[PDB]
């Protein structure tokens, strides 16, 4: 039962179709990885403040997964016969709460979800500073309470109940949060980072302990029942789309150009050019891959600048021999390509059974590399070696978990020895580490946006710099947080007003979170 | 080079010139409120966007090709007793092509057109429209009297295969058309010319076996460069299918669809159907899914396009199609959700390269006779009501005989003619019924359709401003009543252009009524 509550909360993390709209609408534009689909460009790409769209994480987690995890934790707390499920619940509670606070800032946590259990309504919004304090304390204690000789964890879609891997994940999350606070508090950050490395079970040191939620393959449906079906990855469902021929996932130029201009082996693993005239209405079957034809004919790729739609600017196309040939037996096909020259997200990332990414060994290597550049006491491996290991693991992650074609040693070496190289100054090293992390986090948009904001890399420019300033109703600078749902002023007035007063008296998506020291 | 060959080319060019036919899709079909919703039709004619290049198509095409060549051939065969038949046919076709020019622009070169082969005879004067019409009656009368079936064979005639008696019938029927045209501006001359034509050698077109239809061949539609010099197929039908046929097919205007549907017209679903085009060929109307009966069974409203509307504005109310859901099982690109498919489209029978080039029909002759009888002219012993009824029956049978539409039975015809297709009782009711039925007949003859709407005042059409689209009408609120002269004329035929515009007070505006158009 607590074990069943874990299962459902894991499924809801990427399985909730309503919630996943937030990432397509906002995060993927803010990190300049996708742009051109109507939803992504309209909301995040052009800074449309929309309180209902911004509210999806808040409502989803406080009404469902976070609420239920809190209940289950409470019911198993201080029970020596339930220490493993209780500890696992505490780790997952920290994880879900980290998404909330890294989106909105101060928020209910210590007093959350206690109305039925403790008659405690109107929970205060804990200060982000204090939420992060609690993350380190909860994770450390959970690691120390876990005992493999005790209860079996049975509803775990990440590690199949292996509580030693749960210690590795908890200590890796301590690394992530330590590095998160390293601008505002380098001293505490270094201490937390070093403590985690020394903690029981260690950290995730290779991909065999990557934390990935397992999802199944279910046909993509947008009917009403689909909004209560968490069995499939709903982020992948939306990246395919409710309107998949008009509004697929086109890549942003910032990301496509980072890959292409650096010679990254992942360029045409993450993206392809497809003609979709024969594509299924409900799955990415029967697409025509024109990528190699475009390369052979010298046709320029036209990825979407921040602020651009697939149709604005309208691209320069070409006449496809592949499509002309196909039209002979499939007369609905046209040979004239237009928006097909704009790179799209590859089919490997559009599957109901894509994993729900929580944390990878590649990220741990990048965290270790940055801590080493920062002169923390993290071990005997050079920062450069840790960096190279993180890049290799990030590239292999796509092969292992999405079926992308394997990258040879020669291909990796060619890349790492040219534009993927680590660099020779601290700023170049931190730039390379965090640019590589941004690519790794493509399938983890919550972490991708948090790490862009925290590290300041890549250095992203407003859509105004690309010519789209006339559309920026919600202001010029890329938002650094989302606003609280307006109904909170009705359901939780005092606590909401208190949080807003702490920000200076307004709820503004340009206000930096506590751990975010400056913006870009 | 041979005059008989020049006749063939000029006939083919009349509807075979893919560049020139854009004018009808862009302007005429919107001004007569028969098609609306296709981008081109709504943007230009539906929202009064004046564009001199678009308005110039008839002038440029005819004066550089078909009319020029007809004039050359007429000169080469004139005053030669052994060439009287080809010469007379050329004179009749010359009048026909000239009538389209003057009914579009007003005063225009005629007596002085097409010289230049002579010497420095460039810079022709614009003959006054009133005089052009007088010349039409004289030319047609003389050609009828010079024709002699014992003399030269006419060998390249795609209308009548050289049957010169039928050319007499066409010439005298054109005299009826032009006599009725001038019946508001010069009622006494109109009556005299109408009566003279009925009494002339060869008589008029009295049944469908003498309908004047240019025969076109069944060629595949192509929009490549070579297709702009290929006149073998009906290019108006090609354009009504469209260069962008899935995004911008020919949707019907509500004025015309509602006239048909609300009158119980048997032609309603002969001229129009609702289609889902997800599997339709890119270059032909093959593989469309007819949903019309399904909509009727499910009670889904037809949503034809008001004047000024695009297919996407207003966005219509759709439904979920059982037919399409079934087709999606084996054709997964199909969606079952219909949206703009609820807007009636032009039926496939009107989207064929072998659709005839309509010049003049026996149905029109019956409607002209009926109107002349209401006007108390001396036209014979048939009642106006019977002539009207014969006109409607011929107009309906015209679609069966020439477009492959399902035949209308006597019982179906009688049911319509006895109810909402009835002739009516006051003079205004009779004139409205005659000219509303003529408007339907002239659907496949847009030059005549627009002329007769302007001349008769029926149907009574309202500006797109009355349907809510006034904000978009850059070229004025009233529906245009002529097109302006080409900029090529004001640039390179300036003295003659200046003389013509001086007769309109120095103006050259699409709201200025032509001489035969007494009011709007
Ligand atoms: O002629 C011979 C000659 O030819 C030569 O070739 C020529 C050729 O002939 C010629 O045709 C060609 O011309 C080119 C021309 O074709 C081209 O046209 C372009 C044009 O330039 C573009 O501007 C145009 O762009 C369009 C685009 O197509 C549209 O798709 C787009 O539509 C936008 C919509 O997508 C968008 O819709 C969104 C809704 O607004 C929104 O409300 C909705 O919200 C949903 C949401 O998505 C859901 O996720 C959500 O789900 C909720 C959930 O949130 C909650 O949790 O739960 C609920 C239930 O529980 C659940 O419901 O729901 C909400 C609510 O429903 O999302 C929608 C999207 O999904 O809306 C916006 C705004 O309205 C739309 O904008 O619009 C754009 C424009 O705006 O595209 C056309 C193409 O069609 O132009 C070029 C350049 O001019 C031309 O060149 O030219 C060639 C070459 O010259 C030959 O060369 C020659 O040889 C021959 O001779
Ligand atoms: O999700 C859970 C939930 O879902 C529920 O269902 C939801 C669902 O989720 C959601 O997606 C859906 O959202 C709906 C949304 O989809 C819909 O979107 C609409 C939108 O509202 C519209 O506004 C939009 O309209 C677009 C339209 O699509 C475009 O096509 C159109 O494009 C126009 C162009 O077509 C046009 O192009 C022309 C060029 O401008 C012009 O230059 C060019 O000229 C050519 C010319 O044509 C030639 O003839 C000529 O030929 C020359 C010749 O002249 C010479 O002689 O010779 C030459 C060669 O020799 C020769 O070339 O040449 C020239 C060449 O240029 O012609 C072009 C046309 O062909 O350009 C204009 C202007 O730029 C374009 O406008 O634009 C419009 C917009 O303006 O469409 C989208 C759809 O895509 O919105 C609705 C309503 O908001 C949404 O509802 O909602 C559903 C329902 O809720 C489920 O129900 C639930 O269960 C689930 O839970
Ligand atoms: Mg920052
Ligand atoms: Mg008039
Ligand atoms: Na889903
Ligand atoms: Na043609
Ligand atoms: Na008949």
Numbering used by the authors:
A (entry chain B): 40 to 559
B (entry chain A): 39 to 558
From the paper:
A multigene polysaccharide utilization locus (PUL) encoding enzymes and surface carbohydrate (glycan)-binding proteins (SGBPs) was recently identified in prominent members of Bacteroidetes in the human gut and characterized in Bacteroides ovatus. This PUL-encoded system specifically targets mixed-linkage β1,3-1,4-glucans, a group of diet-derived carbohydrates that promote a healthy microbiota and have potential as prebiotics. The BoSGBPMLG-A protein encoded by the BACOVA_2743 gene is a SusD-like protein that plays a key role in the PUL’s specificity and functionality. That study also demonstrated the direct involvement of BoSGBPMLG-A in the functionality of the PUL, as mutations on the binding site and a gene knockout mutation blocked mixed-linkage β-glucan utilization by B. ovatus.
To fully understand the molecular determinants of BoSGBPMLG-A’s unique specificity and chain length dependency, the three-dimensional (3-D) structure of BoSGBPMLG-A in complex with barley-9 (G4G3G4G4G3G4G4G3G) was solved by X-ray crystallography to a resolution of 1.43 Å. Most strikingly, in the complex with barley-9, two protein monomers were found in the asymmetric unit forming a protein-sugar-sugar-protein supramolecular assembly, where the protein interacts with a dimerized carbohydrate consisting of two barley-9 chains related by the 2-fold noncrystallographic axis. The protein-sugar-sugar-protein assembly that constitutes the asymmetric unit of the BoSGBPMLG-A–barley 9 complex may be a consequence of a high local concentration of the oligosaccharide, which might be compensated by the formation of aggregates, helping the crystal nucleation event. The structure of the BoSGBPMLG-A–barley-9 complex showed an ∼41-Å-long binding platform that accommodated and accompanied the natural bends and kinks of this mixed-linkage oligosaccharide. BoSGBPMLG-A bound to the barley-9 through the oligosaccharide-reducing end (Glc1), and multiple protein contacts up to Glc8 stabilized the interaction. These included CH-π stacking, direct hydrogen bonding, and an extensive water-mediated network. As in the BoSGBPMLG-A structure with the heptasaccharide, the triad of residues formed by Trp77, Trp350, and Trp353 constitutes the center of the platform, interacting with the internal sequence of the gluco-oligosaccharide chain (Glc3-Glc7). The high resolution of the BoSGBPMLG-A–barley-9 structure enabled us to identify 21 ordered water molecules constituting an extensive and complex water network that mediates indirect hydrogen bonding contacts with 18 amino acid residues, supporting the entire oligosaccharide from Glc1 to Glc8. In particular, the side chain of Arg378 makes four water-mediated hydrogen bonds that likely contribute to the specificity by stabilizing the Glc4-Glc6 stretch that accommodates the minimum binding motif.
